[PDB]
Write a protein that binds this ligand. Structure first.
Ligand SMILES: CCOc1nc(NC)nc(NC(=O)NS(=O)(=O)c2ccccc2C(=O)OC)n1
Ligand SMILES: CCOc1nc(NC)nc(NC(=O)NS(=O)(=O)c2ccccc2C(=O)OC)n1
Lengths: 196, 188
C-alpha cells in the first residue's frame, strides 16, 4: 500500500461520514485490507489528518512559482482564497486542517511563505504573525459557517418582533449577503492593517 | 441557574463531546424530566452556558470586548467550541444591540458595525480554538526535532515557543482595528 491510495480513500471516506466517523475499521473496509496493514503505514488518527490536510491544501494550490511581479498583498490575498476553497472542498475540512500549519508536511510551504514575505521586507516576526492571522481568520469563518447551518436546525425558528431594531436590520443583512462578503471584508481589514 | 453552574463543571470534567443532558441530570441528581423544564436539548444548554461564560472610544471598545471574550473562552475546556455561532442567539440580543447601537453612534454604518463586530469576534474565537487544539494535539504528535526543520521555520517556531500566544493574538487584533480606522477614514 502506497501513502497516496491510503489518503485519497480517507478523503472519500471523510465526505461520507465526517471527521468523527472516520474509523480504522471503515478505512480498511474501503482500502480492502486487514487493519494491521493499515497500522503498518499510519499510526494514530492524528498522523492521518496531517497527511490529508496537506493533500487537501495541495490540490487547491497553484504548483508554479509566483509571478515575480507579485505584491505581498496579492500573495496573502490568493493564499487566503486558495485556503478557503480547500477548507470548503470536503466535509469537516476546517476541523481537519486546524493546527497543521507547522507540521512536518507543511515545512516546505511555510518556508516558502516566510521566504517571500521576508523577500518583500517583512521582519521574520511580522511574517509569522501575518500568516498566522490570515490563516486562522480564514479557517474561522469557514468553521463559523459550517456551524450556523448545522445549528439553525437544533434551535427554535426565531420571531422577528422579539428582536430589537438594529438586531433585526442586522440579522436580515447577514442572511441576505451570505458567507463570502463577510470573509472578504475581514481579509481586506487585515491587509489594510498590515500596510504600515 | 445552578443547572448551569453544574453544566459548566461537567464541561471541564469531561469535555464538550461527553457533555449530555443524560450525564447532567445523572450528576444533578434529579431525573431527566425535571431537567427538560430548565433546558430542552443540548443546544439550548450550550446557549445558556455561553452567556454565563461571557457575562461573568470605539477602538478601545472593540479591543476590550475582544480581550474579554478571549479570557471567557480560555476559562473553560472547549470554551471556544461551546460559544461558536451564539452571537445572535436570544440571550445575546441585549449585548448585540448595545454594541450595534454604540458603534452606529460613532459614525459606523450599521452594515459596517456588523462586519466590524463579527470580524473581531471570529478572529478572537479562532485564536482560542487554535490554542485549545495545539494543546491536545502535542500529546498525539512526535517531538519535532529542530535539525529536521528548515532555517526560517526554525526561527519562527523557536520564537512562538518562547513568546507564547498573547502577542500573536494582540498583533492580529491591531491589524483589524488599524484596518477599520482606515475604512472609516475612507468613507467620511
Ligand atoms: C509550533 C506552534 O505554531 C503552530 N504550530 C502548528 N502546528 C504544530 N500550527 C500552527 N498554526 C496553525 O495551524 N494555524 S491554522 O490557521 O490553523 C492553519 C491551518 C492550516 C494551514 C495553515 C494554517 C496557518 O495559518 O498556519 C499559520 N502554529
Ligand atoms: C444572522 C446569523 O449570524 C449569526 N448568528 C449567530 N447565532 C445565531 N452567530 C453568529 N456569529 C457568531 O456567533 N460569531 S462568533 O465569532 O462565533 C461569536 C461568538 C460568541 C459571541 C459573539 C460572536 C460574534 O462575534 O458575533 C458577532 N452569526
Amino acid at each position: 500500500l502506497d501513502k497516496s491510495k491510503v489518503i485519497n480513500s480517507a478523503l472519500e471516506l471523510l465526505n461520507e461520514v465526517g471527521i468523527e466517523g472516520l474509523t480504522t475499521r471503515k478505512l480498511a473496509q474501503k482500502l480492502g485490507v486487514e487493519q494491521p496493514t493499515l497500522y503498518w503505514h499510519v499510526k494514530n488518527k492524528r498522523a492521518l489528518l496531517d497527511a490529508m490536510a496537506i493533500e487537501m491544501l495541495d490540490r487547491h494550490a497553484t504548483h508554479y512559482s509566483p509571478l515575480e511581479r507579485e505584491s505581498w498583498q496579492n500573495f496573502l490575498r490568493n493564499n487566503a482564497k486558495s485556503m478557503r476553497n480547500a477548507l470548503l472542498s470536503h466535509r469537516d475540512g476546517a476541523k481537519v486542517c486546524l493546527g497543521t500549519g507547522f507540521t512536518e508536511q507543511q515545512y516546505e510551504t511555510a518556508e516558502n511563505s516566510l521566504a517571500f514575505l521576508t523577500q518583500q521586507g517583512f521582519s521574520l516576526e511580522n511574517a509569522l504573525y501575518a500568516m498566522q492571522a490570515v490563516g486562522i481568520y480564514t479557517l474561522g469563518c469557514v468553521l463559523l459557517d459550517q456551524e450556523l447551518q448545522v445549528a439553525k436546525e437544533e434551535r427554535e425558528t426565531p420571531t422577528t418582533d422579539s428582536m430589537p431594531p438594529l438586531v433585526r436590520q442586522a440579522v436580515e443583512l447577514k442572511d441576505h449577503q451570505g458567507a463570502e462578503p463577510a470573509f472578504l471584508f475581514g481579509l481586506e481589514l487585515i491587509i489594510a492593517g498590515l500596510e504600515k
